[PDB]
Amino acid sequence: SKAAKGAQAKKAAQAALKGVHSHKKTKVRKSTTFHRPKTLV
Amino acid sequence: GALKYLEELSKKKQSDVVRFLLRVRCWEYRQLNVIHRASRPSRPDKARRLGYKAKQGYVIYRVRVRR
Amino acid sequence: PKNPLLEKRPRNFGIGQDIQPKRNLSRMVKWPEYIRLQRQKKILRMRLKVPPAIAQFQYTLDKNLAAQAFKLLNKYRPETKQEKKERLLREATAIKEGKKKEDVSKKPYTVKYGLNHVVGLIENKKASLVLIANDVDPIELVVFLPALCRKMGIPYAIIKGKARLGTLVHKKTAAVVAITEVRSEDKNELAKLISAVKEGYLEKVEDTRKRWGGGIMGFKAQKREEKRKKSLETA
Amino acid sequence: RKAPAKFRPLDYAERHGYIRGIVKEIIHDPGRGAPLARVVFRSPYKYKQITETFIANEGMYTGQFIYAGKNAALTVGNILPLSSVPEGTVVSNVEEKPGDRGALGRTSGNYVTVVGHNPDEGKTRIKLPSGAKKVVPSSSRGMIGIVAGGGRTDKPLLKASRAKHKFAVKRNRWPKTR
RNA sequence: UUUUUACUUAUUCAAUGAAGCGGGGCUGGACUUGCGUCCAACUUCUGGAGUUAAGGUCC
RNA sequence: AUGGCCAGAAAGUGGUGUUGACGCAAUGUGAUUUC
């Protein structure tokens, strides 16, 4: 599709101008409660 | 130095850039605490002319008071 | 062969029937106040209309040109403590033997850093190239610097990373760096970098630096606006 | 008094389907003329059962199953949004806005009469026990029936002691001086 | 420079253990177009029980 | 109920309120009969 080739060209342009590290891992959270992380005492 | 430019820019408090910065900073300071420590002066030229030096032992605290 | 004693118990997670499974609730986590404040601060800076003098810092150098600039600038890092100590010992030896320090030490060529120093060099028209970090807080320290460079006729470029400039200048953070002059074997590289900056950054941001930034609406607000416009077009 | 007499918090279950609860007890609330129905529901996210207190409409009994949600049936004891009820049905413990767990018609023998719907604005018109005519959001929940304990004020108090016992738990000023 | 007519980013109110908000995709039903809308996915004879993933597939 | 009656110098303050017209608050009169 024309949208498919346009998306491929846009992805190539994005890789050329910004690099390949486009994605970042995000932790999944099964609870909505944030706890203070336990640190060295 | 840059602080001359910062002084002449701080004189123009009704310009678009200064009003935008004051608006976003007012929003931030209103959602912060009433008294809280600032890591650095947000007006370095004013702090420097009032006596602040980037030396250990100089502390900046930001505070809001009801007018 | 599988043991026939095994059986399957599928669970249907509809309303009223068995308990819902543990799903990713990261979109709905009650975040701490500082995380919420910084995310809302970034969101507000996108939502509000940004004046051009601040919005010009959104357009930065791309990866290739920033890499070439750092390849040139990494040859001119400032003197370290051990190198300065060795140079001082050699100069003290020359003084003891009855020679000036200029006889044993050569003329240095380094990058120039420190905001007051770089602004003075720009005003004296000594700096050949200026690189300004895109994320200086407060922004008033560098908001005039593109205009000053344009008036002085200095090639300037906004680059990502005050920490990246600090890695050059052996600090945690540098707001702005500059080159006044280089060595003879790097004069061609400096001129090529200056020309590449001129036709690849400044000509592209010549128009976009005058435009107001921000004004982006939210995801839900954009969806509501699209639905309203579609309903108005249909009716 | 142990717990306030509120509905469930508005969640996925009531907003999309229905959830079943069991009426375990009918209790007397001191200072209130109407009985309260203690109803136990399930928690969709955990193993523990949730115990709640409602305002009991007339005809409820212990061991009765009630259904609260968008798709629940029209039966005495069921909690329904006002969009899911027809014209002329009266409900109790009506929400002013969806999520305040009911505010209207909470007194014994009283009810709120759904007099109309406006589907275009997503609103509904109701009639209050005072005769007032009100417009509320149609996603507000309402509980089918009339509140139990009716006819309480027909009997005379007949004694200063009975008035004293009435107002001593109600904290109102008694006796009243001119 | 005035009016209304909207929007949300200031500000105000409410709820929650900040749990399913919005836009899509799958399925079915309706209308219409001649294939986009809207609307529903899931538990109703019983005062029981429901919680430590069963399983499929690559290793 | 973005309500009434209140309280506090103010408050991201409190009560009525674990409240919602068969209720709350302020009045006048003061069983029944008569009116």
Whether residue C22 and residue A18 make contact (CB cut-off 8 A), yes or no, is: no
Q: After which residues is chain D broken (C to N over 2.5 A)?
A: none
C157/C147 Cα distance (integer angstroms): 12
C127/C120 Cα distance (integer angstroms): 9
Contacts of D177 (CB under 8 A, 6+ apart): none
Residue nearest to nucleotide E21 (CA to C1'): C220
Q: Which nucleotide is nearest to D158 (CA to C1')?
A: F31
Question: Is there a contact between C146 and C56 (Cβ–Cβ < 8 Å)?
Answer: yes
Consecutive H or E run containing D114: strand D112-118
Q: Please name every residue paired with C174 in a beta bridge, in sequence order, or none if there are none.
A: none
Give the tokens for residue D63.
Answer: 């061991």
- Protein chain D, residues 27-66, with a C-beta closer than 7 Å to any atom of nucleic acid strand F: 31-33
Q: Using CB atoms, which residue from D13, D46, D47 is nearest to C15?
A: D13
Q: How far is CA B49 from CA B2, B57, C116, C175, in A?
A: 13, 17, 15, 21
Which residues of chain A have a Cβ shorter than 8 Å from any chain C Cβ? 16-19, 26-34
**The tokens 């700096």 sit on which residue?**
C127
Q: Which residues of C touch B2 (CB under 8 A)?
A: 115-116, 119, 141-142, 144
Query: In the PDB record, what is the listed experimental method?
Result: cryo-EM
D4/D7 Cα distance (integer angstroms): 9
Consecutive H or E run containing C157: strand C156-159
D39/D52 Cα distance (integer angstroms): 5
D109/D89 Cα distance (integer angstroms): 15
Question: Is there a contact between C195 and C188 (Cβ–Cβ < 8 Å)?
Answer: no
Task: Give D119 CA → E32 C1' in Å.
Answer: 21
Q: Please name every residue paired with D85 in a beta bridge, in sequence order, or none if there are none.
A: none
Helix (H, G, I), strand (E, B) or coil at D80: strand
D117/D84 Cα distance (integer angstroms): 11
D39/D91 Cα distance (integer angstroms): 18
Q: Using CB atoms, which residue from D12, D18, D45 is nearest to C19?
A: D45
Strands across the sheet containing D90-92: D50-55, D36-41, D18-27, D65-69, D79-81, D141-144, D90-92, D112-118, D123-127, D133-137
Contacts of A38 (CB under 8 A, 6+ apart): none
Give the tokens for residue D143.
Answer: 């509980």
**The tokens 């305002």 sit on which residue?**
D55
Whether residue C15 and residue D44 make contact (CB cut-off 8 A), yes or no, is: yes
Give the tokens for residue D93.
Answer: 């413990």
D169 touches strand F (CB under 7 A): no
N residues, chain A: 41
Residue D136 CA to its chain's centroid (Å): 16
Q: Which amino acid is at D159?
A: K
State the pairing for strand pair C156-159/C129-133: parallel
Query: For chain D, first and last CA: distance in Å?
Result: 32
Give the tokens for residue B37.
Answer: 């420590």
Residue B46 CA to its chain's centroid (Å): 8
Contacts of C222 (CB under 8 A, 6+ apart): none
Q: Which residues of C touch D12 (CB under 8 A)?
A: 15
Residue A16 CA to its chain's centroid (Å): 17
If one counts every other C-beta atom within 10 angstroms of the C-beta of residue D147, the result is 23
Q: How many CA atoms lie within 13 A of D61 on its CB side?
A: 3
Question: Is there a contact between D39 and D23 (Cβ–Cβ < 8 Å)?
Answer: yes
Question: Is there a contact between D63 and D38 (Cβ–Cβ < 8 Å)?
Answer: no
Question: Is there a contact between D41 and D52 (Cβ–Cβ < 8 Å)?
Answer: yes
Residue (of C64, C72, C97, C24) closest to C200 by Cα position: C64
Helix (H, G, I), strand (E, B) or coil at A18: helix
DSSP state of D104: B
Residue (of D94, D105, D107, D74) closest to D137 by Cα position: D94
Q: Which amino acid is at C80?
A: T
Which residue in chain C has the smallest CA separation from A18?
A: C63
Q: Which amino acid is at C102?
A: E
Contacts of A13 (CB under 8 A, 6+ apart): none
C172/A17 Cα distance (integer angstroms): 27
CA trace torsion B21, B25, B26, B27 (10° rounding)? 110
B50/D22 Cα distance (integer angstroms): 72
Q: Which residues of C touch D17 (CB under 8 A)?
A: 14-16
Consecutive H or E run containing C177: strand C176-179
Consecutive H or E run containing D115: strand D112-118
Residue (of D19, D92, D12) closest to D52 by Cα position: D19
Contacts of D109 (CB under 8 A, 6+ apart): D146, D147, D149, D150, D151, D152
Q: How many CA atoms lie within 13 A of B40 on its CB side?
A: 8
Whether residue C15 and residue D16 make contact (CB cut-off 8 A), yes or no, is: yes
Q: Which residues of C touch B1 (CB under 8 A)?
A: 115-116, 119-120
C129/C149 Cα distance (integer angstroms): 9
Q: Which residues of C touch A17 (CB under 8 A)?
A: 62-64
Rg (CA), chain A: 19
C104/C158 Cα distance (integer angstroms): 38
Q: How far is CA A7 from CA C62, C96, D42, in A?
A: 20, 71, 48
State the pairing for strand pair D18-27/D65-69: antiparallel
C111/C166 Cα distance (integer angstroms): 12
Query: What are φ and ψ of residue D115, in 5° steps?
Result: -100, -15
Whether residue B24 and residue C48 make contact (CB cut-off 8 A), yes or no, is: yes
Strand F nucleotides in reach of protein CB atoms, 7 A cut-off: 1-2, 16-30
C69/C63 Cα distance (integer angstroms): 10
**The tokens 């699209």 sit on which residue?**
C226
C133/C146 Cα distance (integer angstroms): 11
Question: Is there a contact between B18 and B9 (Cβ–Cβ < 8 Å)?
Answer: yes
Consecutive H or E run containing D116: strand D112-118
Residue (of C21, C28, C11, C15) closest to D46 by Cα position: C21
C43/A29 Cα distance (integer angstroms): 23
Contacts of D159 (CB under 8 A, 6+ apart): none
Encode C116-133: b = buried (16+ Cβ within 10 Å), e = exposed. eebbebbeeeebbbbbbb
D109 touches strand F (CB under 7 A): yes
C104/C32 Cα distance (integer angstroms): 59
Task: Give D65 CA → E45 C1' in Å.
Answer: 11
Residue nearest to nucleotide E11 (CA to C1'): B27
Contacts of C39 (CB under 8 A, 6+ apart): C31
Contacts of A41 (CB under 8 A, 6+ apart): none
Question: Is there a contact between C155 and C198 (Cβ–Cβ < 8 Å)?
Answer: yes
Consecutive H or E run containing B45: helix B44-50
Q: What is the DSSP string of chain D?
A: --S----PPP-HHHHHSEEEEEEEEEE--TT-SS-EEEEEE--SSSSS-EEEEEEPBTT--TT-EEEEETT--S-TT-EEEGGGS-TT-EEESB-SSTTS---BS-STT--EEEEEEETTTTEEEEE-TTS-EEEEETTSEEEES-BS-TTGGGS---SHHHHHHHHHHH----S---
Query: Smallest CA–CA separation between C63 and chain A, in Å?
Result: 6
C75/C112 Cα distance (integer angstroms): 13
Q: Do chains C and D touch (3 or more CB pairs under 8 A)?
A: yes
Is D93 marked within a binding site? no
